[PDB]
């Protein structure tokens, strides 16, 4: 269940970061559980274990998964009573993640850097002891890396390796 929790949280991390940069670009930053919900992978990922075809069931499963984001102060509850459920995003929390990932890749220099190494270094640096499962997932690292690439900060290289199956 820990691996599944990381999977759900990584999706919610991306959806939040995206809603964060989108609202910051538009203009203190408040997101609705209905906005958070508008993402295909979140729904697909929650459907692995939960039936969330009903709007309300989906929102409940999101609420439950977002409790840990509130505990690590990435989010703060602002509206508690459905249909008005809302969260204030911590700008510093997500900025702090950008800083760490940026430094981590810069420090690697010409040697470069893979997904796993960035996931682990960021996970280590955040040090979110109050949660039993990692919050940073591969899918989320993927989003960060491609965001950086879009801003010319990094170059991504596909290096396929293959192995004979004995």
**DSSP secondary structure string, 71-134?**
HTTSEEEEEEETTEEEEEE-HHHHHHHHHHHHHHHHTTGGG---HHHHHHHHHHHH--TTSSS-
Alpha-carbon span 15 to 31, nearest angstrom: 10
**103, two tokens:** 């430094």
> What 3-state class would DSSP assign to 56?
helix
**19, two tokens:** 């809603």
Resolution (A): 2.4
Looking at the structure, give the CATH architecture of the domain made up of residues 2-90. Orthogonal Bundle (1.10)
Q: What is the CA radius of gyration of the chain?
A: 17
Tell me the technique behind this structure.
X-ray
Alpha-carbon span 5 to 88, nearest angstrom: 22
The DSSP element (H or E) to which 34 belongs, if any, is: helix 33-37
65 labelled binding-site residue: no
Buried b (16+ CB within 10 A) or exposed e, 38-62: ebeebbebbeeeeebeeeeebbebb
User: For residue 112, is the peptide bond before it cis, meaning its omega torsion is within 30 degrees of 0?
Assistant: no
Nearest residue to 85 (alpha-carbon basis) of 45, 40, 55, 49:
55
92 labelled binding-site residue: no
139 labelled binding-site residue: yes
**87, two tokens:** 């969260």
> What 3-state class would DSSP assign to 38?
coil
- Residue count of the chain, please give it: 166
11 labelled binding-site residue: yes
Location of structure tokens 């820990």? 2
């Amino acid at each position: 269940t820990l691996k599944y929790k990381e999977l759900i949280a990584g999706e919610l991390m991306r959806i939040t970061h995206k809603l964060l940069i989108q609202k910051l670009q538009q203009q203190e930053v408040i997101i609705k559980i209905q906005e958070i919900a508008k993402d295909q992978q979140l729904y697909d990922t929650l459907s692995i274990q939960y039936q969330v075809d009903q709007k309300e069931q989906y929102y409940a499963k999101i609420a439950q998964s977002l409790e840990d984001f509130v505990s690590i102060s990435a989010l703060k509850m602002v509206s508690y009573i459905y249909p008005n459920i809302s969260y204030q995003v911590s700008i510093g929390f997500f900025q702090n993640i950008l800083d760490i990932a940026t430094k981590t890749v810069k420090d690697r220099g010409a040697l470069g850097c893979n997904y796993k190494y960035l996931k682990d270094k960021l996970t280590k640096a955040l040090n979110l002891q109050q949660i039993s499962y990692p919050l940073i997932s591969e899918s989320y690292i993927s989003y960060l890396v491609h965001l950086f690439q879009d801003f010319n900060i990094i170059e991504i290289e596909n290096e396929h390796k293959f192995y004979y199956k004995q």
